[PDB]
Ligand binder design. Sequence first.
Ligand code: CLA
Ligand code: CLA
Ligand code: CLA
Ligand code: CLA
Ligand code: CLA
Ligand code: CLA
Ligand SMILES: C=Cc1c(C)c2cc3nc(c4c5[nH]c(cc6nc(cc1[nH]2)C(C)=C6CC)c(C)c5C(=O)[C@@H]4C(=O)OC)[C@@H](CCC(=O)OC/C=C(\C)CCC[C@H](C)CCC[C@H](C)CCCC(C)C)[C@@H]3C
Ligand SMILES: CC1=C(/C=C/C(C)=C/C=C/C(C)=C/C=C/C=C(C)/C=C/C=C(C)/C=C/C2=C(C)CCCC2(C)C)C(C)(C)CCC1
Ligand SMILES: CC1=C(/C=C/C(C)=C/C=C/C(C)=C/C=C/C=C(C)/C=C/C=C(C)/C=C/C2=C(C)CCCC2(C)C)C(C)(C)CCC1
Ligand SMILES: CC1=C(/C=C/C(C)=C/C=C/C(C)=C/C=C/C=C(C)/C=C/C=C(C)/C=C/C2=C(C)CCCC2(C)C)C(C)(C)CCC1
Ligand SMILES: CCCCCCCCCCCCO[C@@H]1O[C@H](CO)[C@@H](O[C@H]2O[C@H](CO)[C@@H](O)[C@H](O)[C@H]2O)[C@H](O)[C@H]1O
Ligand code: OEC
Ligand SMILES: [Fe+3]
Lengths: 40, 339, 33, 38, 31, 37, 30, 53, 37, 476, 76, 172
Amino acid sequence: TITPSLKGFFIGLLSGAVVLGLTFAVLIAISQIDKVQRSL
Amino acid sequence: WFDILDDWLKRDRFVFVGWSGILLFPCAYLALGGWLTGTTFVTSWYTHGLASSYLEGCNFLTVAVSTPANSMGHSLLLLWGPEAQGDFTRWCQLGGLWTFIALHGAFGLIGFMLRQFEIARLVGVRPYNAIAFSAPIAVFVSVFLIYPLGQSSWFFAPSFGVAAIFRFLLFFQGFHNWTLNPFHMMGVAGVLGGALLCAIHGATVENTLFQDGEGASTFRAFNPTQAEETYSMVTANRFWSQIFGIAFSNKRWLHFFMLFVPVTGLWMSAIGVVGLALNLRSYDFISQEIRAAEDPEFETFYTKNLLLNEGIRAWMAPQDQPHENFVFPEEVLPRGNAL
Amino acid sequence: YPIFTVRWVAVHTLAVPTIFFLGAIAAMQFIQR
Amino acid sequence: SEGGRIPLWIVATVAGMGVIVIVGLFFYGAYAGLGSSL
Amino acid sequence: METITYVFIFACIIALFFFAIFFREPPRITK
Amino acid sequence: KLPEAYAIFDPLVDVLPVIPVLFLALAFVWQAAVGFR
Amino acid sequence: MEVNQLGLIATALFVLVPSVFLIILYVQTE
Amino acid sequence: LNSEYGKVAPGWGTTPLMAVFMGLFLVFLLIILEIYNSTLILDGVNVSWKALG
Amino acid sequence: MEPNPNRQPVELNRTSLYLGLLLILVLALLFSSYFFN
Amino acid sequence: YRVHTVLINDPGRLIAAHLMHTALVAGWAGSMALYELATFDPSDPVLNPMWRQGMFVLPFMARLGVTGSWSGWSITGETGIDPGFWSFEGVALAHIVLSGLLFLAACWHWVYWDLELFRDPRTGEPALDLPKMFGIHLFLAGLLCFGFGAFHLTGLFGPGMWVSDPYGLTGSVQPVAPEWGPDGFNPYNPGGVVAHHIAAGIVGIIAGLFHILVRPPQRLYKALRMGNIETVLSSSIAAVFFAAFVVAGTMWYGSATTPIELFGPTRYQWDSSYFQQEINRRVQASLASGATLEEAWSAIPEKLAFYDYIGNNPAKGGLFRTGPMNKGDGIAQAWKGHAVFRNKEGEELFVRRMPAFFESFPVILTDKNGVVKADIPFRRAESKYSFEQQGVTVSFYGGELNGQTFTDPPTVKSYARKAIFGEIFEFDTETLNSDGIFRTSPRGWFTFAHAVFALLFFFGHIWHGARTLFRDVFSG
Amino acid sequence: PFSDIITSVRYWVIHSITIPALFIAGWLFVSTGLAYDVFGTPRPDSYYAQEQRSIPLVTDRFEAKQQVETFLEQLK
Amino acid sequence: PLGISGTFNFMIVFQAEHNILMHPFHQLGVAGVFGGALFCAMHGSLVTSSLIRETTETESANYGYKFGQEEETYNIVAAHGYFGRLIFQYASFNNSRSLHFFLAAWPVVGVWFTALGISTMAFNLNGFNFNHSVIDAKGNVINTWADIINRANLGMEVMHERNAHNFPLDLA
Ligand code: CLA
Ligand code: CLA
Ligand code: CLA
Ligand code: CLA
Ligand code: CLA
Ligand code: CLA
Ligand SMILES: C=Cc1c(C)c2cc3nc(c4c5[nH]c(cc6nc(cc1[nH]2)C(C)=C6CC)c(C)c5C(=O)[C@@H]4C(=O)OC)[C@@H](CCC(=O)OC/C=C(\C)CCC[C@H](C)CCC[C@H](C)CCCC(C)C)[C@@H]3C
Ligand SMILES: CC1=C(/C=C/C(C)=C/C=C/C(C)=C/C=C/C=C(C)/C=C/C=C(C)/C=C/C2=C(C)CCCC2(C)C)C(C)(C)CCC1
Ligand SMILES: CC1=C(/C=C/C(C)=C/C=C/C(C)=C/C=C/C=C(C)/C=C/C=C(C)/C=C/C2=C(C)CCCC2(C)C)C(C)(C)CCC1
Ligand SMILES: CC1=C(/C=C/C(C)=C/C=C/C(C)=C/C=C/C=C(C)/C=C/C=C(C)/C=C/C2=C(C)CCCC2(C)C)C(C)(C)CCC1
Ligand SMILES: CCCCCCCCCCCCO[C@@H]1O[C@H](CO)[C@@H](O[C@H]2O[C@H](CO)[C@@H](O)[C@H](O)[C@H]2O)[C@H](O)[C@H]1O
Ligand code: OEC
Ligand SMILES: [Fe+3]
């Protein structure tokens, strides 16, 4: 049985996921596209 | 895919965004905007009774971001908080900003000491700076978290503004006589000692600089090989020794001692506050009070002060604390003759 | 040279809001009552 | 020294004076509200 | 007595002066 | 206001007395145009 | 006046222990 | 060589398993924290001394 | 008696003592009143 | 200066050191336990409970069911059948004996610090395989958690946990059963405690086994530089640091483990008029049932009214040496007296209470609607609401001690101020030469200590951490 | 920054039209009155309901929202 | 007064009589001081982090330098590199003159002003005081954070030097 604050708690997770997801996605991406100059 | 990010991310550019760079900037940015936003656009008289922003016309000094209402305790009312119910505008009316700023802002401080650790293992330097930084962070938590926790609610925590801070000061003087606390005294010691050092060190150097190092005789040069640097310890030594009487001459100590004084201080001060959080204070001298009541021809500055306080408390608590709703009849107020 | 996170974002993230406020504030100063 | 060079001591003066006009306002503005104080 | 104790700890802080300023360990360049 | 017939110039007279300060200002612009030395 | 006599013992030991302490170490040094 | 029980000598590690668990932790506390702080509200979950079964 | 995991040399110098005492007494001074009263 | 640095390299020698610190903590509980027993007051639990003496340890011994003393003295008051074979008295001997044993041993791993004995290992003499230590010590800890919650607490073995109702004092130790749903997930249903440890105990068992078997991937030695102790130190410091701030709030706010007759009341109950409320409902309820005001008050149990006196809310006290509550009020012996302040027309006046924030308050009387009727003027000249000009009267319909009526303005006034403190009591001031200034409960003291320490261990976490990961930097 | 775009004309060109576009965009943010309704920062018209000498306070932790509204309906 | 306690009194009475808190000269004062604190920690902190990592310093001993020591104690490139990477290049200081000059400039010119602050309020040119902001609507006075400052400044005025005033307004 959910009471309004249970949604919020869930929305929090979701909203956490959203910003957390985009953050990594984008960064993981920009790290590959502009690779690090190196020769060994 | 990992190490890469490590590098791309830790790539030495203009503004170093390290692993910690993720906490620091999102938080230290919002904590700034949070202030500046409300400062310029929000009113906090639904929650505090006063004028919060520029929108109502306060001067920079007056404007601030006021603390939530005492009726709410410590509920972190985030946008999706059962209380604000997602309605932004009200989430602001209620002060949901304070919490914003303190939380995000607490992590920005977390990020900034982290960023201070990163840079030391990339460059290969000592972590010391990152450690000196704990003092402020202590002061911060001590102040804005510990204290409000111990008391009735969020309301009593400093308010995010200029004047709103001065009012804090005074508040403390009246109900806590924080000035008598020994801890604030030591804190008061290091801060003034930090500035005393900063002067003598900076002036001694500048003034003991090597003669003729510049023909033109101005002083805007150096180089790496300038191993010896521009000044004398031997002369400073004797200078001090003969003027002040003492002078430990060992550069490495001088600088470290310069870490000890300021920082050592703020830790105390912060301790002192964890104490007040629990209305545990150094506001009284039993010995004196006792003889103060059995005898009316005896008075000391200790006493004269305790009088001012009650004046602070009586006059300032009914407008300053709207929730209890204090009603104080003219006569009742303490009052020196003719004023 | 190109546009980049550091140079680029940093500057406009801080620098753009400012003029929006300075603009809003400039408007305040003339309000009545 | 203006062979038609790209200016800087001008930029330095443009904004500098510009800022004075915004702040200047901020002072004027500080008059429109406290002024009805009583 | 609350007194002598604030005095006692006083005379030491001055005794420590003299002894610190006039009986300190030398700062020499023999190095 | 007691200037009578000159009435006309309150303006210029009003922003007048500040100039001594603005003298300091050019001084730095003078420097900017001369690369600071 | 009225003072808590335990202060004396407190304030005296504060003076001695850390002091004694350091006094022991400055002798081993030499 | 997967001889018997799961073997991974140094390997990138057992980070994902762990990472998954520190995750079920942070979610745990927040809940706790919110309930204790009365930011969460459940049936029969009264946070006053009065709660007596 | 025959173990070498330890670096067995403890030192405090003349100067370190002066600052050591200067702290304890001053420190004591301050607090004195509080313990007492 | 650095000296305890020497122990970093040797295990058997460092296990000695660690033994003595542990030997002193056992010998401290003795001093403390013993000291408390010689000082404690048995005479009356209702008006002079342990939290008023300023007893510190006693509370936790009670918490887990230690109530007897070899001399008969029990906190429940019912001693006709008390024979705890190992009570406080004996618990003292325990810790002291323990302190003793541990001590002697220390000496013999400090003198006998080599790895050449009757042992079976995994270790090369100049090393200690941490990730294995953890698993080993872990499993055996998780096993404990299990028992403590399963047997101890559930009555399987008798030392049930201590329980209490919302308000009063009807709490005695009784077995506690855990209800795993949510209702018992919060901090108040002891079921949350019992359930916890059982569950966490199991997880510890598992987690142990699987921390003993798998070994550090590459994060432990490569990232968290774990070849040396240093990290075990920083690692753990932050854990305790975390716990110290948990307990601290636990104490101050109150949880199932921070009951009432063990540590006293809370500031949250004072600002909440939590007591005044229950008290009121006991009067409108009984009053409506055919009793006279006099009768109703004389009904409501007194301990309940005591909890209402403000002197029982952690009020003031940075430095107040013995700080037991009693050198404040004095020894309380009184009544559940309600002072009813009526006017000349019979209207019932209501006095405003003093907020735990102020050190001093201005005696003021309000009407039932919020109106201002009486006050105690400072500037008597242009006074208008005096007590004499409006004639007030105090009439006590309270616990036995005072069921009468008063008129004089000097007398009447006195109570107004003593009213401001909530309920009114009488204290045996003379037995301890109380000065008459408020002091703080073990709660405030337990908190102020544990929060500062924790704050203080934050530096400890960050110092040793960085000093761990910058070996070479340390050397410069 | 040694003056990098600080000297070119494109920098002035793309901003000469950009910055005065926020300077204004903002100004209209205040003249239009979105601030007030988006932020809820009562205007001089709406502080006290004529002859309502009390200050809106907030009491219930859960009714903050319905409380606040109760205050806006009043002024109207 | 030449006592600890009275120092406090002088302070209190002082801002209740001249309202200093809101005076730039005491504001720069807090700037000068909180300045010196932040800098005396910064300098000595960095100077300590960028030391000559390899000079006779082991993990059991730590012994000093003496003028005879050429290269001095630390690698300034490491410090200038550190600080520069924490914020930005400009932010860091290139040479030792600008560093130590700053250390003696901030504090001194802060107190320069404060010491003036007092001297300026010695002849009654007290700090700011924004006592009223209104709602011309009805003229309803709205209290600005600064008024609750005047509410405290008030209580104290009333009782400073109790019973030594015979007339209504203090004039000195
Ligand atoms: C979890 C427990 C813990 C443990 C095992 C250690 C262990 C160690 N610490 Mg760490 N430390 C801790 C917590 C801990 N610390 C915390 C919480 C802090 C924050 C303050 C620190 C701060 C700290 C610093 C700043 C330093 C160490 C150092 C050291 C090493 C010191 C060896 C030495 O020379 O000691 C010598 C110790 C003493 C002579 C003891 C002095 C006793 C104290 C100061 C008196 C306290 C009195 C108090 C005010 C009230 C009165 C007391 C009453 C009983 C009368 C050792 C590895 C040192 C190091 O690594 O050096 C290279 C070092 O410099 N520690
Ligand atoms: C966990 C760390 C630890 C370790 C590695 C050791 C290791 C050792 N101990 Mg020590 N001990 C410890 C903790 C530890 N002890 C503690 C906390 C105490 C205080 C209770 C003692 C008390 C102690 C005593 C009194 C004696 C030893 C002895 C010994 C040596 C025994 C020979 C052997 O190989 O046994 C093989 C055993 C193991 C690998 C398992 C050790 C596991 C636990 C800690 C031991 C529990 C045993 C306990 C002492 C028995 C109580 C009696 C019981 C009837 C209630 C061995 C070097 C003997 C010695 O020669 O020292 C002078 C001895 O007489 N120990
Ligand atoms: C023989 C075993 C033994 C026993 C039965 C006791 C029993 C008792 N002790 Mg004693 N003690 C012991 C050994 C023992 N002690 C030792 C070796 C020492 C050190 C010398 C002490 C030091 C000591 C002190 C200083 C005090 C006591 C006190 C007490 C009483 C405490 C009641 C309480 O609520 O504790 C509560 C205990 C806790 C809250 C511990 C919680 C542990 C942390 C939070 C767990 C962290 C978990 C871990 C990291 C991870 C697990 C994960 C999981 C998944 C597996 C109780 C009678 C107190 C007293 O009143 O004295 C008379 C007291 O003040 N004891
Ligand atoms: C590490 C966590 C932990 C802790 C801190 C404690 C702490 C405590 N236990 Mg518990 N216990 C635990 C785990 C723990 N226990 C587990 C896992 C079990 C199941 C194996 C038990 C089983 C248990 C029993 C059976 C008893 C305790 C008791 C006690 C208290 C003893 C004080 C003391 O040390 O006296 C020093 C020594 C003694 C008191 C000797 C007790 C003698 C043995 C252990 C039991 C004999 C049983 C007998 C039928 C009981 C008569 C007593 C009567 C009051 C019912 C103390 C609060 C005792 C208590 O105070 O009773 C209410 C008690 O009788 N505990
Ligand atoms: C967990 C820690 C702890 C706690 C919370 C308590 C709590 C309490 N004790 Mg116990 N006590 C403890 C440890 C503790 N004690 C220890 C280890 C001992 C030694 C065995 C005692 C011995 C003891 C005795 C003998 C008595 C108490 C009493 C009391 C009660 C006193 C009320 C009070 O006013 O205290 C007052 C608190 C203070 C004065 C602390 C002031 C803070 C310090 C001194 C400041 C130090 C300054 C700073 C650190 C130095 C400068 C730093 C430098 C770096 C610049 C209280 C319940 C009394 C009692 O039982 O009541 C009947 C009592 O008579 N205690
Ligand atoms: C936690 C946040 C916080 C913040 C952000 C502030 C901020 C401020 N406080 Mg407040 N304060 C706080 C908490 C805070 N305070 C608390 C908890 C208390 C206790 C209740 C106080 C008590 C207090 C008092 C009593 C006073 C202030 C004052 C001030 C102002 C001081 C100006 C100053 O010189 O500072 C010191 C810092 C510096 C001098 C330097 C800051 C660094 C600058 C920004 C760097 C500029 C460098 C540039 C970017 C690069 C150049 C590169 C170079 C190489 C050329 C400032 C606006 C004072 C004031 O004047 O009020 C209006 C004042 O009197 N505060
Ligand atoms: C007036 C008080 C004071 C201020 C304003 C201040 C400020 C600063 N100190 C820094 C550093 C330091 N300060 C240090 C020691 C000290 N600093 C001291 C006192 C101060 N230090 C003292 C007394 C010491 C001695 C212990 C050290 C050792 C360092 C550094 O290493 C570091 C540096 O690099 O030096 C320049 C900078 C850290 C930036 C950051 O971490 O952002 C991250 C976080 C942000 C932006 C926000 C967190 C959220 C907080 C709660 C909100 C603040 C928002 C305000 C309320 C809004 C603006 C208000 C206006 C009135 C200004 C920052 C400029
Ligand atoms: C809230 C929010 C948000 C957003 C926002 C932000 C982030 C903002 C920011 C903002 C900002 C950031 C703003 C600003 C403004 C500013 C201004 C308005 C300024 C001004 C200035 C000036 C005027 C200056 C000057 C000067 C001079 C003249 C001299 C001396 C020095 C100085 C420098 C002081 C989001 C969506 C995320 C979400 C959550 C919420
Ligand atoms: C003829 C005439 C007259 C006269 C006039 C005069 C005498 C004038 C003057 C004027 C002036 C005298 C002016 C000035 C101006 C100035 C300015 C406008 C300036 C500016 C500047 C700037 C902008 C700068 C910059 C900078 C730099 C360089 C560096 C550092 C920083 C800064 C940014 C600050 C009269 C009226 C009687 C009338 C009749 C006619
Ligand atoms: C060997 C043995 C024995 C015996 C034993 C004994 C008799 C013991 C004792 C022990 C003891 C008798 C111990 C003690 C300890 C103590 C301690 C460990 C303490 C500590 C303290 C502290 C830590 C303090 C604190 C403080 C102060 C004083 C001031 C203010 C602040 C504070 C809080 C910091 C027997 C016959 C059974 C058998 C065989 C073996
Ligand atoms: C469907 C209904 C669900 C009920 C949800 C809970 C509603 C609140 C009930 C409070 C009943 C009071 O009893 C006690 O009150 C005090 C507040 O005075 C609480 O304390 C709580 O509020 C105070 C202030 O508002 C906060 O600072 C504190 O962090 C918080 O925990 C105690 O934890 C509670 O035990
Ligand atoms: Mn020392 O003081 Ca200058 O304020 Mn008014 O006058 Mn006398 O009363 Mn106080
Ligand atoms: Fe220097």
